[PDB]
């Protein structure tokens, strides 16, 4: 807990996350009305959190001291005010389009690591995953502002922040997913027969 508090105190870049999440130097509705979720060491999970500035971001995150926090979408109303609203009022409007890639689906083809282990040798699977995915987004969808972030142990998260990608609806996101997801059946005991 002390290390995590210190990390949120002096090392995590709150300003850069706020600037990329707001998509404007001046704070805007992309940040005040965006949902945040904090996962605690005790296992508690609080949703609908939101921040109005970098300083409020810092104070709230340092005070709560969560082990990790996850980013939500942009809503029409401030999520932190959820208890004052009906359930039907909080409508999701925009979220950066994401992919999740993990080593879990490649354990049947790697011998350099068994179970929850990872090294440079097995990371080539994930590297080819980003290569193919990035080629697809750039050439076929025309997206430009996408960045990959290490998942912490053996995975990588994609974050497409293109203005077209943020505002895509659920069906359009599903269409892009099933476009990229050629291998819909992950079992190794049966022919794909693509």
């Amino acid at each position: 807990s002390s290390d995590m508090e210190y990390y949120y105190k002096s090392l995590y870049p709150f300003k850069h996350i706020f600037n990329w999440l707001n998509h404007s130097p001046k704070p805007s509705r992309d940040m005040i009305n965006r949902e945040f979720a904090m996962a605690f060491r005790s296992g508690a999970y609080k949703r609908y959190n939101s921040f109005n500035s970098v300083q409020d971001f810092k104070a709230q995150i340092e005070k709560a001291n969560p082990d990790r926090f996850e980013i939500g979408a942009i809503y029409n109303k401030p999520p932190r005010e959820r208890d004052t609203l009906l359930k039907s009022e909080l409508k999701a409007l925009e979220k950066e389009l994401v992919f999740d890639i993990d080593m879990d689906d490649y354990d049947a083809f790697r011998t350099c690591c068994s179970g929850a282990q990872v090294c440079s040798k097995c990371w080539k699977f994930i590297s080819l995953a980003m290569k193919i995915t990035n080629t697809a987004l750039r050439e076929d969808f025309g997206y430009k502002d996408f960045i990959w972030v290490f998942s912490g142990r053996r995975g990588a998260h994609c974050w497409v922040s293109d203005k077209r990608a943020r505002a895509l609806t659920d069906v359009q996101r599903r269409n892009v997913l099933d476009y990229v997801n050629v291998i819909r059946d992950r079992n190794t005991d049966k022919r794909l027969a693509l």
Binding site: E139, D140, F141, G142, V171, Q172, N175, D178, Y179
Partner: peptide, 18 residues
């Protein structure tokens, strides 16, 4: 392709550069 997603998912339509 955004107006032809249903055809896209089934590889019924050829795509280039969006």
């Amino acid at each position: 392709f955004e107006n032809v997603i249903e055809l896209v998912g089934n590889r019924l339509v050829f795509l280039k550069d969006g």
